[PDB]
């Protein structure tokens, strides 16, 4: 039903900073059932990252003011939390129903499994103490599978492989409270990527290099 | 609901940069009939400023694409959708102002501020106004601005920030919508010069640079 008209309208929304609209277009494109292109793939992700990220930022503000009649903050934080769980469940619904199953290329399988690890990580950050274990399990399980595949099929300099390391390391350090595992994951990714630094083209170097600078900062931050 | 709890909740939303929530809180407070305090009035204004301003910015962008074949058809389709949201938000504010905020207002300082808001919200409708109703909408913006302008003159000193903000906005109305640069330039210069002479609060200074920035761009 004019998927290009939606992929186009989605591009128009991102330009106008209307991510909620952009998400509505990309989700409809995903719902068709045809495997997404690498360009649609990245539009659906940017849309959802901005929509859920607004909620995460708001929650970190309302939950920081809660720390310092503040019962109102707890009520609002509950609100924002419901919006955030709803958006995560959405993305995860798309992931299980269409994206992961239609993923033919390995690079997309890693990109999608990483997204699943991130969206469960966002649910973990706001989880009821009871539900938290299961949700943490789900995130780690998704990232571990993406990891194994990226190791097998991608070069250490691949940005999807490097971005997976960055996010999986931040999951261990914050979600799992494991500094030794998180630092080790980030340092290996950086080291293996710099072992093969000669491979990066003049045109495509910045894509992996930017992520590497980021692995280093987390490591610098976590070690000091 | 509790009007103060809603007022508190609006402060939380603003800190969180959740304006649609902020606006929903402040709209309810105004509906109660309580005259807004110089704090509730600011909160209602900031919330709505940011709601409509997001639409105003997306409009300019989606239009710009139109001036810069199948895509052009789709952009107009998007431009019209954003226009409908923008009109809707303006009409909301205009209903509050006309129906509650302006009638309840007793002090002159508040009345000048509410009449300036009515001039701004009609100015935003004029920017996307359908050609048929375009003259009526501009008439309404100008009238709101002029009425506030005269009252400002007779009740405030030039240094007052509301009087200064009124001049800035009313000036930009003349240049952008009435295409009358001499008025807008002349009107803007007079407020600055009057502001410069009394110059006796540092919020007014912020406004003077904005007036200076515009006479300068127009220069």
């Amino acid at each position: 039903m004019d998927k290009n008209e939606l992929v186009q309208k989605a591009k128009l929304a991102e330009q106008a900073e209307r991510y909620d609209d952009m998400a509505a277009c990309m989700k409809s494109v995903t719902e068709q059932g045809a495997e997404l292109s690498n360009e649609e793939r990245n539009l659906l992700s940017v849309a959802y990252k901005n929509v859920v990220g607004a909620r995460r930022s708001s929650w970190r503000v309302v939950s920081s003011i809660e720390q310092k009649k503040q019962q109102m903050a707890r009520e609002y934080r509950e609100k924002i939390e419901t919006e955030l769980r709803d958006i995560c469940n959405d993305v995860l619904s798309l992931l299980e129903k269409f994206l992961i199953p239609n993923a033919s290329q390995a690079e997309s399988k890693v990109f999608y499994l990483k997204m699943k690890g991130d969206y469960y990580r966002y649910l973990a950050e706001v989880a009821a103490g009871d539900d938290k274990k299961g949700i943490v399990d789900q995130s780690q399980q998704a990232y571990q599978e993406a990891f194994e595949i990226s190791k097998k099929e991608m070069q250490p300099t691949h940005p999807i492989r490097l971005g997976l390391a960055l996010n999986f390391s931040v999951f261990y350090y914050e979600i799992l409270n494991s500094p030794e595992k998180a630092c080790s994951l980030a340092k290996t990714a950086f080291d293996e990527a710099i072992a093969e630094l000669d491979t990066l083209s003049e045109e495509s170097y910045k894509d992996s290099t930017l992520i590497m600078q980021l692995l280093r900062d987390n490591l610098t931050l976590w070690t000091s | 609901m509790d009007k103060n709890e809603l007022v508190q909740k609006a402060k939380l939303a603003e800190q969180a940069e959740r304006y649609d929530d902020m606006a929903a809180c402040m709209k309810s407070v105004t509906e109660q009939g309580a005259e807004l305090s110089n704090e509730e009035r600011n909160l209602l204004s900031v919330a709505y400023k940011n709601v409509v301003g997001a639409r105003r910015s997306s409009w300019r962008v989606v239009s710009s694409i139109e001036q810069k074949e199948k895509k052009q058809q789709m952009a107009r389709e998007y431009r019209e959708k954003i226009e409908t949201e923008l009109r809707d938000i303006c009409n909301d504010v205009l209903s509050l102002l006309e129906k509650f905020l302006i009638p309840n207002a007793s002090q002159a300082e508040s009345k000048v501020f509410y009449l300036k808001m009515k001039g701004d919200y009609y100015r935003y409708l004029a920017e996307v106004a359908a050609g048929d109703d375009k003259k009526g909408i501009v008439d309404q913006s100008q009238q709101a601005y002029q009425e506030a302008f005269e009252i400002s003159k007779k009740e405030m000193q030039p240094t007052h920030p509301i009087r200064l903000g009124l001049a800035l906005n009313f000036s930009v109305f003349y240049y952008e919508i009435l295409n009358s640069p001499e008025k807008a330039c002349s009107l803007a210069k007079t407020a600055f010069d009057e502001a410069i002479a009394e110059l006796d609060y540092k919020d007014s200074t912020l406004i003077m640079q904005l007036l200076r920035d515009n006479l300068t761009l127009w220069t």
Binding site: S45, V46, K49, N50, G53, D118, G163, L164, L166, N167, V170, E174, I211, L214, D217, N218, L221 | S45, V46, K49, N50, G53, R60, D120, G165, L168, N169, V172, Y175, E176, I207, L210, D213, N214, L217
Partner: peptide, 18 residues
Amino acid sequence: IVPATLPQLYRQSSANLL
């Protein structure tokens, strides 16, 4: 260029920036 009008507007680093 648009003319000026009033009013006017720690830790962690993960991929897909904003």
